[PDB]
Design an enzyme around this catalytic site. Structure first.
Site, mmCIF file in Angstrom:
data_model
loop_
_atom_site.group_PDB
_atom_site.id
_atom_site.type_symbol
_atom_site.label_atom_id
_atom_site.label_comp_id
_atom_site.label_asym_id
_atom_site.label_seq_id
_atom_site.Cartn_x
_atom_site.Cartn_y
_atom_site.Cartn_z
ATOM 1 N N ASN A 83 42.271 25.172 112.337
ATOM 2 C CA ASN A 83 41.840 26.470 112.793
ATOM 3 C C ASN A 83 41.249 27.203 111.588
ATOM 4 O O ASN A 83 41.987 27.839 110.824
ATOM 5 C CB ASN A 83 43.052 27.211 113.375
ATOM 6 C CG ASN A 83 42.695 28.480 114.144
ATOM 7 O OD1 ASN A 83 41.656 29.108 113.913
ATOM 8 N ND2 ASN A 83 43.574 28.877 115.050
ATOM 9 N N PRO A 84 39.918 27.098 111.388
ATOM 10 C CA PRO A 84 39.329 27.834 110.264
ATOM 11 C C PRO A 84 39.526 29.332 110.396
ATOM 12 O O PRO A 84 39.716 29.823 111.509
ATOM 13 C CB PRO A 84 37.827 27.535 110.378
ATOM 14 C CG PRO A 84 37.609 27.034 111.732
ATOM 15 C CD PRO A 84 38.908 26.347 112.154
ATOM 16 N N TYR A 86 38.045 33.052 110.742
ATOM 17 C CA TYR A 86 36.843 33.638 111.349
ATOM 18 C C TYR A 86 36.560 34.960 110.689
ATOM 19 O O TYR A 86 37.474 35.767 110.527
ATOM 20 C CB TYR A 86 37.050 33.971 112.827
ATOM 21 C CG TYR A 86 37.715 32.897 113.657
ATOM 22 C CD1 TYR A 86 37.576 31.534 113.328
ATOM 23 C CD2 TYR A 86 38.434 33.235 114.799
ATOM 24 C CE1 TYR A 86 38.179 30.545 114.106
ATOM 25 C CE2 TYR A 86 39.035 32.264 115.589
ATOM 26 C CZ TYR A 86 38.926 30.932 115.237
ATOM 27 O OH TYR A 86 39.505 29.984 116.057
ATOM 28 N N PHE A 174 43.808 33.341 122.182
ATOM 29 C CA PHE A 174 44.638 33.941 121.132
ATOM 30 C C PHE A 174 45.136 35.304 121.619
ATOM 31 O O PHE A 174 44.340 36.247 121.755
ATOM 32 C CB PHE A 174 43.866 34.123 119.812
ATOM 33 C CG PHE A 174 43.450 32.835 119.146
ATOM 34 C CD1 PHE A 174 44.346 32.119 118.346
ATOM 35 C CD2 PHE A 174 42.151 32.345 119.302
ATOM 36 C CE1 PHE A 174 43.949 30.924 117.710
ATOM 37 C CE2 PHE A 174 41.743 31.147 118.677
ATOM 38 C CZ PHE A 174 42.650 30.435 117.881
#
Ligand SMILES: CCNC[C@H]1O[C@@H](n2c(NCCCCNC(=O)CCCC[C@@H]3SC[C@@H]4NC(=O)N[C@@H]43)nc3c(N)ncnc32)[C@H](O)[C@@H]1O
Ligand SMILES: [K+]
EC number: 2.1.1.72
Length: 391
Positions: A83-84, A86, A174
């Site tokens: 999960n990079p 953002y 999310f």
DNA sequence: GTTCGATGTC
DNA sequence: GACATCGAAC
């Protein structure tokens, strides 16, 4: 990352026995843990993390303290997942990611896909691809915005030519974060794009194949149907009928000497998206805190002197249009001026643009990827002869 | 000239 | 959920 999202991504992941498995921006390494649980221990597990306070891997994994975007490892990887971060890199007053000018310069030097303002998540994607062995796999969860936006055109083209891509739409997964997400599964081999919808159950997410684009070269990605195709060929695209321009921006108005911060005689509000409704403009209510003489508006944009069609930019993915009969100053929205030899029926065109058919059409194609109707969506809207005709 | 938002604020 | 950023960024 929510556990069902991790489990879904891990179900998409593969590595050879003994393969190098990497989680960038790993913190405590939730992806490494889930992958090991699901697939066993015969892999080389690596996690990369910039914050010393955050890196907390089990002793079976190797932790590296580094900015992933500038990290130069000795060897390439078979699998990269996670999960990079953002966020746009810019001034703290407006943007969430704050780095020295000199570091931002290093990112731009490093990344061939860096375009406009760009985003950490795009740079994370490009870095990951560069770190994959031939035939390597990445699986990331990222915003959906890259499927449609100009800022990500170089990224889409880079992916298209570097390997094969599967995109899985998740949407707003999310809690307490305002982002519509997708999973990308990239393999550094073959070619093409596969688009997938998903259904969520207690059991987790289930992929449903939507469409395949075997010759994908980086074009905008949309959820097309038999109905969207039928509508698109029914008329001329809007972009062939109009020049599409944007409003002058807030700072241009604010420093203009004819602009005032209080109402007064001969003074008119500078209009925003809150002045635009389906089929009409509220000329009285001020939402910008700005007022000017109407006749001076052309000094900012020549087209402010001329009655013309306005289309909203920030009302979500929909088409809200009105005819500005009065020709006022605007701070926001698209301004559409007919091209040479174009015949229009303003009243009926506005009606068509605000119609339920049109709202369905755009929601189908672009779901909720971004909170906008963008120019690239707008220029493709079909207009049949009754409303507008290029002779 | 115009783009973008782990949106911003109600 | 409603209802939209608005100005740094290039
Ligand atoms: C998806 C959630 N990400 C959270 C983690 O990612 C981290 N993280 C941040 N996010 C900003 N930038 C990076 C750099 N470029 N490299 C490696 N790790 C990173 C941060 O320290 C958090 O621990
Ligand atoms: K983060």
């Amino acid at each position: 990352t929510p556990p069902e999202v991790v489990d879904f991504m891990v179900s998409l992941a593969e590595a050879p026995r003994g393969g190098r498995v990497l989680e960038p921006a790993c913190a405590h390494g939730p992806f490494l843990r889930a992958f090991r649980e699901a697939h066993g221990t015969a892999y080389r597990f690596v996690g990369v993390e910039i914050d010393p306070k955050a890196l907390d891997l089990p002793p079976w994994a190797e932790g590296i303290l580094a900015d992933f975007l500038l990290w130069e490892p000795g060897e390439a990887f078979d699998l990269i997942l996670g999960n990079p971060p953002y966020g746009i890199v810019g001034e703290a007053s407006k943007y969430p990611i704050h780095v020295f000018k000199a570091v931002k310069d290093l990112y731009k030097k490093a990344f061939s896909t860096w375009k406009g303002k760009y985003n950490l998540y795009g740079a994370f994607l490009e870095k990951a691809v560069r770190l994959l062995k031939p035939g390597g796999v990445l699986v990331f969860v990222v915003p959906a915005t890259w499927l449609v936006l100009e800022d990500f055109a170089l990224l889409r083209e880079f992916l298209a030519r570097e390997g094969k891509t599967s995109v899985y739409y998740l949407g707003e997964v999310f809690p307490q974060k305002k982002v519509s997400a997708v999973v990308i599964r990239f393999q550094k081999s073959g070619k093409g794009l596969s688009l997938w919808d998903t259904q969520e159950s207690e059991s987790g997410f289930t992929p449903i194949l939507w469409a395949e684009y075997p010759h994908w070269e980086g074009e905008i990605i949309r959820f097309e149907t038999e109905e969207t195709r039928k509508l698109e060929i029914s008329g001329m695209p809007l972009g062939d009928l109009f020049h599409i321009r944007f409003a002058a921006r807030s700072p241009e108005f604010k420093k203009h000497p004819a602009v005032r911060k209080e109402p007064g005689p001969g003074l008119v509000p500078v209009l925003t998206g809150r002045n635009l409704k389906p089929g009409w403009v509220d000329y009285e209510k001020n939402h910008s805190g700005l007022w000017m003489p109407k006749e001076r508006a052309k000094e900012l944009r020549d087209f402010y002197a001329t009655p013309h069609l306005v289309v909203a930019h920030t009302k979500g993915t929909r088409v809200v249009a009105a005819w500005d009969e009065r020709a006022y100053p605007w701070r926001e929205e698209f301004h559409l001026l007919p091209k040479e030899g174009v015949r229009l029926d303003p009243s009926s065109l506005v009606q068509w643009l605000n119609s339920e058919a049109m709202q369905k059409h755009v929601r189908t194609l672009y779901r909720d990827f971004v909170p906008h109707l963008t120019l690239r969506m707008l220029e493709r809207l079909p207009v049949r002869r009754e409303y507008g005709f290029h002779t």
